[PDB]
Amino acid sequence: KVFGRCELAAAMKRHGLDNYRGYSLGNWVCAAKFESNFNTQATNRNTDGSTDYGILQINSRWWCNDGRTPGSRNLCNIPCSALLSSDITASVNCAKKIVSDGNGMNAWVAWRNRCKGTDVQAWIRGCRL
Numbered sequence: 001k002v003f004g005r006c007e008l009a010a011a012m013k014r015h016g017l018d019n020y021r022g023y024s025l026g027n028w029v030c031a032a033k034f035e036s037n038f039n040t041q042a043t044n045r046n047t048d049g050s051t052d053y054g055i056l057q058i059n060s061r062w063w064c065n066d067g068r069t070p071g072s073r074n075l076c077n078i079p080c081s082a083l084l085s086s087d088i089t090a091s092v093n094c095a096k097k098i099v100s101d102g103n104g105m106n107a108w109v110a111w112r113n114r115c116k117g118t119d120v121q122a123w124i125r126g127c128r129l
């Protein structure tokens with residue numbers, strides 16, 4: 001599924017992301033925009049052979065099992081495919097574990113390089129929330 005902007009902001013809020021670990025909703029929307037263009041089916045292979053999955057491009061090195069990332073963990077206890085569902089519940093739940101891991105939203109390099117420090121509220125501007 002490709003979410004609309006305000007559609008995704010609404011789903012994220014309903015699953016308790018808005019201000020989670022102190023990150024306002026625009027931060028999550030901006031990160032998903034640059035990680036996946038709001039497409040739940042987005043995948044991207046990394047140089048190390050791990051893969052990133054879903055709206056927040058969560059990585060198989062640590063967070064999910066895909067059966068093809070040697071030496072990796074599955075700290076969210078999920079198949080990476082669950083991260084590609086139209087229902088964002090597994091991506092949100094695993095994102096809450098990632099953003100709690102110590103480095104906050106710096107875990108997502110596209111958030112640090114394209115969202116951090118910017119006027120992230122613009123991403124939820126005009127949305128009924």
Ligand SMILES: C[N+](C)(C)CCO
Binds near residue numbers: 109
């Ligand atoms: C969300 N991760 C930390 C797993 C990677 C970003 O693409």
Ligand SMILES: [Cl-]
Binds near residue numbers: 021022104105
């Ligand atoms: Cl933080």
Ligand code: NA
Binds near residue numbers: 062063067074
């Ligand atoms: Na894994």
